[PDB]
Symmetry: C2
Amino acid sequence: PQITLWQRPLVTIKIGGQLKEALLDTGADDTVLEEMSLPGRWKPKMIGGIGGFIKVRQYDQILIEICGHKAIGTVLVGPTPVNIIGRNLLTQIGCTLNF
Amino acid sequence: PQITLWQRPLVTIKIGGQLKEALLDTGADDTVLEEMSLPGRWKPKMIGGIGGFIKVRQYDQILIEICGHKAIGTVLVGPTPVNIIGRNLLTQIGCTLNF
């Protein structure tokens, strides 16, 4: 799908069997999800943006379905105000910017 | 141009006669620029993302040339780690996401 930017580019994702909305964020190197329950092992980690830093848990090799195309990769979980799908997964679904 | 996401989608902008590099950021409602010298009046303002908030000055109706397409709109200036071109201006240069 082509998605214009007059509103927030929110899409539906399925991850860990749950459904969430998240923001396609070309500004984000990685993908960060709100406090949620996820399988596997994980290393702690801190990430920054505007405003500063949060502590997050980092899980590797997680399957995610983003608007119905599947991606596997790293996912951080922590106290983010919004779920964000970062470049690490956007590249796997073939996501490009065009103008 | 079509721009894939394997690296940060950094482009060259001209604003206030100066040149800067900035990040096309579909996660950003507005455009925020590092500490720089800009004309006109301005209201103070605070914005948030991940990590929290910063105080910024807000200037309205600023011309900006983003990879050589011109856009006019609001521009915030403040202590951001990276210059970010937000949706307020991406829409004016015709920017879309496609996958």
